[PDB]
């Protein structure tokens, strides 16, 4: 694991053919990368257009999180964490961009 | 301005 998943992180289901965005509501306290709420293991349920339509026949677990941080009973999510779905299968929801956009400042405009 | 940065794992 390298990064931490925050609000409005891009994610897809293994069945739904639409790259939906994560929604964080269990956390109103821990923000990072500005004012973006951190995604934890308590981000369960309808926490996501939920990938458009379901395609299982043509969220309860968040394994892969960081275990060295405890944010009020839950652990923060990581770019390699995978989520399940009650209507789908285990580890169906993944991440590509974890909602962290680095805006460059005056220091970052000198190193170019 | 400093902007915003990334909280990651070293």
């Amino acid at each position: 694991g390298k990064e931490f998943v925050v609000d409005k992180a891009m994610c897809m289901c293994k069945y739904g053919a639409a790259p939906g965005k994560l929604m964080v509501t269990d956390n109103q306290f821990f923000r990072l990368n500005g004012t973006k709420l951190c995604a934890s293991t308590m981000t369960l349920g309808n926490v996501i257009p939920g990938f458009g339509i379901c395609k299982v026949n043509p969220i309860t677990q968040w394994n892969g999180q960081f275990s060295k941080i405890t944010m009020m009973g839950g652990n923060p999510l990581t770019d390699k964490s995978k989520g399940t779905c009650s209507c789908g299968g285990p580890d169906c929801i993944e991440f590509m961009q974890t909602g962290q956009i680095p805006v460059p400042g005056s220091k970052q405009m000198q190193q170019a | 301005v400093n902007g915003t940065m990334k909280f990651m794992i070293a």
Binding site: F29, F30, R31, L32, N33, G34, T35 | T4, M5, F7
Partner: protein, 585 residues
Amino acid sequence: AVSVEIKVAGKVCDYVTMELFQSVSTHHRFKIKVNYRPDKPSVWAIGPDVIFKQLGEKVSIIMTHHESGEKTEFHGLISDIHVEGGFVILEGGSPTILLDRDPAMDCYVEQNLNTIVSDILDKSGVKMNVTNNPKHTDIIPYVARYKETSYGFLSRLLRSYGEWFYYNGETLQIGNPDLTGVSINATIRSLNHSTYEFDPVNDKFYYDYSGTPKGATLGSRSAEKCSEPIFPTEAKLPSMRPAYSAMDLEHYGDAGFHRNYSQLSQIKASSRYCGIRLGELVVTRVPTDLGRYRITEITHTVDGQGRYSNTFCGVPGGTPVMPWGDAVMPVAYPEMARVVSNEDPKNQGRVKVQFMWQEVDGGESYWMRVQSPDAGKSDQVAKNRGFVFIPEPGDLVMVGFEQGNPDRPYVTGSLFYKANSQGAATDNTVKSIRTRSGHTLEFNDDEGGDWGITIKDRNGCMFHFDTKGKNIEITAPETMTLNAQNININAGEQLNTSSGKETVMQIGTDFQQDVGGNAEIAIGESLTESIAKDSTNSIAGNLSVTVDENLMYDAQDMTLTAQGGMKLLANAKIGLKSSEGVDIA
């Protein structure tokens, strides 16, 4: 027509010749040549020693004038006996002769003339009638009898105060009660004289110019008028005796003036009449009036043939004071004495001493001034300016005498005898001033030893200039306080502060501590610091704070700005607990 009867111890004396001399200023003296008839046992049969037993025996001499019936009476005592080969010669004189054979030391403190005279006459074993009525009844602070007989001391003392002091032929009077030849004499004498006396006890200057005459005859006035233009300049002299008041010096100068004036014109006369007696007034007439004269001395002579003659001298009648005569002022020289007190009732720094002659039997003197190396007053001080170290009782002092007068003693200085001194130091090293408590101002000149200065007391406080080491030491057994408006403690090299228990800096307003080098503080217990305002700290190097136990910081707003990286390291959890949010950007 004069018959003279001589009785020795009440027995009629058979005299071949007689001489008698009476005076108001010196001793009466008689010389009787006692006859020894051939039929009676000779002087060698009796033996001079047996005849000598007549020493001190009373002698009565009665000279009576047959025609007039007047008598002159003399009562004396035999003082010398000469057995010559044979006959006997008795030289007795007046009883005051036996009072003039015992020089001694004595002193009379706060006595009048009556008491001194009575004491002198009581201490002696010569019994004679005395009319002790001296005119000066005021008490005298100090009178010294210095190597003087009883009579000599009494004579000089009573004639210093102008009192009459003479034997009248039957009584020692103290105080005012047809001629054959004649000789009146006049002299040129100076009446332009004055007396001075300084009284330091009263801080006064007494000046007495020459008085005015009382007993003046025609010759006295003529001599005075003749001698008036010869002495235009006044002669100032000090009083022989001390004077304690202006009236005292007035009396002294009056007596001196009258004694001087009475010698301007005097009389000598001869007679054969026993009515002219010592101290009487006679009218001298040419056998036409030469004046009234008081008989000052008279001689009574009987030759072998039995013829009585008379020779006398007289001073102008009305003269208040009799001649100086036997009186003579003594000369005193420095003595040694012991201070017996210094509680001067007049508060003038005077001391009371006891001389060596009044040591076995005790006794003291009057208060005397103490000489000082520095003494006086100024505008700012006005009293006790100088060197005031009053002698303490038991000190051995040297007593000098102002002028030559034994009655004017003063302390010249103090002496270091066997008991007083312990000796000088190595090569006379230590020069000290010490008081009776133990306060010591000492200079030590031994450059190889304890060279330097010291001010100390016996309880421990000390101020020492160590000249060999160039150091200064100030030691207080209990407390040393330094009070000033501004105090500067400037150390060329080192300033060391040491406290056994506490160092308490009570700074009034502001504290400035500028350290040019390192600041090393080692605190042996807890440190507690309180600031009532901001607390700024600028560190140009590294700030390290290593705490062996828990570290606690409380504030309202905390900001940690790192110009480089910030690191939060822990062996346990790191707690980020807030209320409105935690943003880890």
